[PDB]
Ligand binder design. Sequence first.
Ligand SMILES: *Cc1c(COP(=O)(O)O)cnc(C)c1O
Ligand SMILES: *Cc1c(COP(=O)(O)O)cnc(C)c1O
Lengths: 400, 400
Amino acid sequence: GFQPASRISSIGVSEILKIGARAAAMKREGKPVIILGAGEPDFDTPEHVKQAASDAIHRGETKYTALDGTPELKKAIREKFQRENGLAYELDEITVATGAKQILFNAMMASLDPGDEVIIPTPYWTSYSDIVHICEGKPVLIACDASSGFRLTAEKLEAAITPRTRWVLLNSPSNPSGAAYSAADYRPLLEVLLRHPHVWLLVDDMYEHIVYDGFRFVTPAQLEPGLKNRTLTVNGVSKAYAMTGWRIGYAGGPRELIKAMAVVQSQATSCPSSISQAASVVALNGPQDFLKERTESFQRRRDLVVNGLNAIDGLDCRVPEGAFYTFSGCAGVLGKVTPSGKRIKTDTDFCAYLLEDAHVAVVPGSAFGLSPFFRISYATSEAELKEALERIAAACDRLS
Amino acid sequence: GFQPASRISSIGVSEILKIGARAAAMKREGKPVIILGAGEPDFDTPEHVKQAASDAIHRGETKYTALDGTPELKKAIREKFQRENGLAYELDEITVATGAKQILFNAMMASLDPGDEVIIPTPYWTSYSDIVHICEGKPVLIACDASSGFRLTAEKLEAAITPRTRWVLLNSPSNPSGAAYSAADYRPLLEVLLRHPHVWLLVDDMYEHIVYDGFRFVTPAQLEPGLKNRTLTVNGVSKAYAMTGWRIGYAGGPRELIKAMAVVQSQATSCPSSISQAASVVALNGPQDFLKERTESFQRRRDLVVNGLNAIDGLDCRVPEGAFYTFSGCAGVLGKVTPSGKRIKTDTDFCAYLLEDAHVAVVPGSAFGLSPFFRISYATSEAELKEALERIAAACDRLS
Ligand SMILES: *Cc1c(COP(=O)(O)O)cnc(C)c1O
Ligand SMILES: *Cc1c(COP(=O)(O)O)cnc(C)c1O
């Protein structure tokens, strides 16, 4: 009889998976369901990156690499940080792993002891707290509502820090709100952190290259040199280059942390795929102009969803600054009754109604730690979004 | 300053890496050291496997897959276990990870609580005990000397089992010994394990397809159906297909352990590379005849090393059954003096003399937990092996 380790005892089944399972069963019943939960861009890997992978395969780059990345890829990353972020890292301050997921995992495994706290602003994707839990740490969730654009404030950060705080997670743009920090937004938070030298910064910049309206992306180790010696700047090719299947993430940070992360990586995975690494060299080093057209395509779909929802009675949707999610408010539908007699008390109730009665799957704000809201991923076709918006509107109009 | 987590406090630097670094420095100095430490086969990924990868890239198989493997790869693994090992595993009993390294890591992370014991027969590679350490377990090392062919015996396994024993590691063929368990070798251990239902079997079959002399490969869950509900059968494409850089390992085992491993994998890596998975489908489903020529090439090189060492007074080398390592005794050189006046007291001293004065780098048995021996990897060219054996013989002749 199998007995799971205690370290996974606090990891449950995500509400997102439960929703996915219900939608899947409904399809088996013969009920087509639109699921608005895409977690990867609906673009392919760029052709020149595909060709670089094929060339590496042909040349026989099929052997183990250096544990935490080829020198060539580390140099491509160093150049990316300098070119794109005005951020200077040495080669021994750079690490490469199997996705940004493993970057985050390695960093927590390399640092957290039982009871160590990690401050996580919400709304947030629970994947972050599951990583903290398996490393025996304590997630400390800090709710940030629309009044601060879903962003952490200096006052809330200061009040959240305790003797056990080891990290603060700063993820911008984020899943599910799409909120991004400008330099003005970051500065008061970095001032707080300058006064807390034992608190390290876990910076997740994965949506850097999906930002809208001309937003100038910045990152804390760039803005505040006084925090560079305790910041892990996490990034990767998954979202920027539509390379989620390739599993390459990377980071820049202090050499002693990078060294500890390599100890974890040596136990967990050894080196990431040599083929994906070779692909990622050319993703970073090659032409970048194609990113503009993809951003414009995402932004057109952002506007479609935001404007669609703000034409529906009961909903109020802010304009996300980046990533490919909307996090619309739905306070206006609470208290209404469905045609079948059900009272809509929570955003959970509302999303369950949209699923069963409108055959559209969205995720309630309750699952991300802030209500009353719901998340749409618009990394899908304009046609599917238009149909889903029509169904959501019709279902909202049937509430009374 | 950075404080590493307690969970890596027992993981140090491997003596193998220190030896490789010193050998590498000598070569930079113009001393043409032959380093006999290859841990991957010196063949390339088969052409048809390369083509399948390039085809999958071109088709756009660049997205996240199912967390623990595509249905196509799980089906190919299911057929491999049935066709090659007579083992019947369901789809929910199969998992795919970033190398067999991650299979082992996930299994230990999913099961071990602090203080849980894992029995590790020695001679062993400390990579196994490092994994147990980072999962907060206690490696229980059981030395198996040449009198049992470097294999675990029933009496030693029975004596080593305690209430806290969670796993016994059964790795056949072995790095560093090259020894493999026949059915007759396994049977008394399996009889012991039937009497201890709390002990699970961690079966590392990675060198399955590098076995010699017509050896009939067998694996515990096939040999003893009464243990299949608590055996993890670990395997992978790295060694069989020369695909170490692609990072794909897999396992068959009880559904509840497979489920818990997926919880770990979701925090550590998400899915392994979609491209490597597609290559591995064809590695497993494709033609296997090429393995014959590779085995014959490996066996010729094995014979070079065994016969070469046994022509040197003071060395006694057993014939390995599989993998590409010899683990020769060197008791007959202990007590002798080098031309520079150093007395050779340990296999450590002997190997340092071979490095500095014969310009051949091998690893002493002390590094694997059994003396007096030394390990050679013969996954290199016959010419390089013949030259290395000449140098070892000359250096042994100069002893007094
Ligand atoms: C996609 C994503 C990740 C995971 O990246 P992978 O490299 O695919 O593992 C981590 N953080 C954020 C904010 C992401 O969008
Ligand atoms: C090579 C090897 C491993 C590691 O396999 P990867 O898939 O490359 O991580 C594990 N066990 C044994 C016996 C091996 O030979």
